[PDB]
Design a protein around this ligand. Structure first.
Ligand SMILES: Nc1ncnc2c1ncn2[C@@H]1O[C@H](COP(=O)(O)OP(=O)(O)OP(O)(O)=S)[C@@H](O)[C@H]1O
Ligand SMILES: [Mg+2]
Lengths: 187, 325, 127
DNA sequence: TGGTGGTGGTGGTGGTGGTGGTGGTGG
């Protein structure tokens, strides 16, 4: 927790040494070193603390991670591979951004996303008709505007050269992967 | 060929020399691989299961909604085994068992072991400890939604414990699968129901505790409530149907129904008359039941009462109905 | 963070204090030539290349320019984004849209002025 | 009659939990 991290930050400066797990647990108000160990591990997994041989190696962030691709046209293979990061604020985008995707195709030209761009997605599964979403249809991803009714869902284009893609929920699997929130272009 | 015969014999000798006598044999010669079953307390359900009961040395799972009757079913199962001389244990992770109601369904309350663990790991450790002993024939775990991990116990509310109980359950099944079959014990897990958020198509209900038990079980049952049983203007029981949603010892997907009467358990004699009709051993002369050329009653209640008061016909019907199905 | 340029009045540079919308910490190294500052636009005139109303266009400030590049400039001391095509003594700023028409104003009457290139686009508007 | 001198890392585990009621019509 943030308070636990602060306790190490000032205790180490005040005394010159980090507090023991027993001391942290006692300050937390519970009779178990596990209380301190859980928070120390959580901070370490966050990348804020280092651990070696059961002891802290030190008390020593890269921005949105680019994860994979997405297709404006026909669906494209879904496979996560974190190839790199970009240093940009989550606060810029309307709901906070979670990761970036690379766009191929031209089926959303009118709204303003085109080939080779980066699209910021906000992770969620609650969405409604008329929004811009990301969907997986049998291990293949597409970005389009949603229109759900009955047992069939329509994924509409935003370019007059492309025609809508329709999937029947009784034959193919459909999971919504998030909600688009913006774009970054550097080409 | 002649060379292959001796080449295989030497390998079998080596394996039996290293890992012990019986580490390999012809599948048609191992009598430890035969299946044995024990009754479940309700005749319709034994017919549905195919083999005639629940298998020993295996894992069984029973899940359903609330006030559905899956503790009475398990106490009914316990009761029959004790009548045959088998020792039993019951593990109440939920902290909700009533001793007297167990005594009143038929259970010998002075010989049934009981534990109330403070952590799921402790419950599973006790399960393994009794399985290794070779002296307990039936274990029951009151609920899996209550098996809390130790890390979750010592923490605070609101902490994230993503996927920890599932990992614990996988480890547990992995470690118990062998001891159960070696000791020939039956382990029954009861489970609850929750909802899947954001599902687009299909049935949203699921169970808690992960995916491992869906694989490692031999039999899974679904138990639900249908209606009320009226002794008059006041309710005196429930109507139940069970489904066999999984089965590794017989054909799956069958069904079964019966009544649970508060304070007594399943009414066997109510099942007997229904099975007799369906099998032409009992005559329904319209609104009137009939048997062997005589008139019986004006309804199911009268028929079962008459049968109860008349052991001769009850035995005659039961010992024939058992044979066909 | 990097400064943001909003509405621009005449007689002062783009980065004048009253033109500063705020600071948004965006790393300047992401773009081909280092981005110096950002500038809000009404991009109805550059749709076909993917610029819209309300989006932000990153600029690396420099007066040097060549043919075929997209440049931020001023004519009549008014800010505009458009591509540059040079005839010689005459130069024209051009659109990338289906309804707009060139700008070839006379330097002797009103001269073009460059402030920087356009390196990339960022947006956060409603979808 | 008298002892020298250290090599080289290996492999991931597991899923959670549903929320909320609109609007009268004809002699
Ligand atoms: N002590 C009791 N006396 C009379 N009836 C009981 C008693 N306990 C349970 N019942 C009834 O038996 C029916 C099924 O309840 P149980 O099987 O005992 O519990 P369950 O349905 O398996 O699980 P939960 O705790 O209700 S979610 C219900 O109609 C109960 O009202
Ligand atoms: Mg119960």
């Amino acid at each position: 927790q943030q308070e636990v991290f602060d306790l190490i930050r000032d205790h180490i400066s005040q005394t010159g040494m980090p507090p023991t797990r027993a001391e942290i647990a006692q300050r937390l108000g519970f009779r178990s070193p596990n209380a301190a160990e859980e928070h120390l591990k959580a901070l370490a997994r966050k990348g804020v603390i280092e651990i070696v041989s059961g002891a802290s190696r030190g008390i020593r962030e890269e921005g949105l991670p680019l994860v994979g691709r997405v297709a404006a046209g026909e669906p494209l293979l879904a496979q996560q591979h974190i190839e790199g990061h970009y240093q940009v604020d989550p606060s810029l985008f309307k709901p906070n951004a979670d990761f970036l995707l690379r766009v191929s195709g031209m089926s959303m030209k009118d709204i303003g996303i085109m080939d080779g761009d980066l699209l910021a997605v906000h992770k969620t599964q609650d969405v409604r008709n008329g929004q811009v979403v990301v969907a997986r249809i049998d291990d293949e991803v597409t970005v389009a505007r949603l229109k759900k009714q009955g047992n069939k869902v329509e994924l509409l284009p935003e370019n007059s050269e492309f025609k809508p893609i329709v999937v029947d929920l009784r034959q193919q699997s459909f999971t919504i992967e998030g909600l688009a929130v913006g774009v970054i272009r550097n080409g | 060929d002649e060379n292959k015969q001796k080449a295989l014999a030497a390998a079998l000798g080596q394996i039996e020399k290293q890992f012990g006598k019986g580490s390999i044999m012809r599948l048609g010669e191992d009598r430890s691989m035969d299946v044995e079953t024990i009754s479940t307390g309700s005749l319709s359900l034994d017919i549905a299961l195919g083999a005639g009961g629940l298998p020993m040395g295996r894992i069984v799972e029973i899940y359903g909604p609330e006030s559905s009757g899956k503790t009475t079913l398990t106490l009914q199962v316990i009761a029959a085994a004790q009548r045959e001389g088998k020792t039993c244990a019951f593990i109440d992770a939920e902290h909700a068992l009533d001793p007297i109601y167990a005594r009143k369904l038929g259970v010998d309350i002075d010989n049934l072991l009981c534990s109330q663990p403070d952590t799921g790991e402790q419950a599973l450790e006790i399960c393994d400890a009794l399985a290794r002993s070779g002296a307990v024939d039936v274990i029951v775990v009151d609920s899996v939604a209550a098996l809390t991990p130790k890390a979750e116990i010592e923490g605070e509310i609101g902490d994230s414990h993503m996927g920890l109980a599932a990992r614990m359950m996988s480890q547990a099944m992995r470690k118990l699968a062998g001891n159960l079959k070696q000791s020939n014990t039956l382990l029954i897990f009861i489970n609850q129901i929750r909802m899947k958020i954001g599902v687009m198509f299909g049935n949203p209900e699921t169970t808690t505790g992960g995916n491992a038990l869906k694989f490692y079980a031999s039999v899974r049952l679904d138990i639900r409530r249908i209606g009320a049983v009226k002794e008059g203007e006041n309710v005196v029981g429930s109507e139940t149907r069970v489904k066999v949603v999984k089965n590794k010892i017989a054909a799956p997907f069958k069904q079964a129904e019966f009544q649970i009467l508060y304070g007594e358990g399943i009414n066997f004699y109510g099942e007997l008359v229904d099975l007799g009709v369906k099998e032409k051993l009992i005559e329904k002369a319209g609104a009137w039941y009939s048997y062997k050329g005589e008139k019986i009653g004006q309804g199911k209640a009268n028929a079962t009462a008459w049968l109860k008061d008349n052991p001769e016909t009850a035995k005659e019907i039961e010992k024939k109905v058992r044979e066909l199905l």
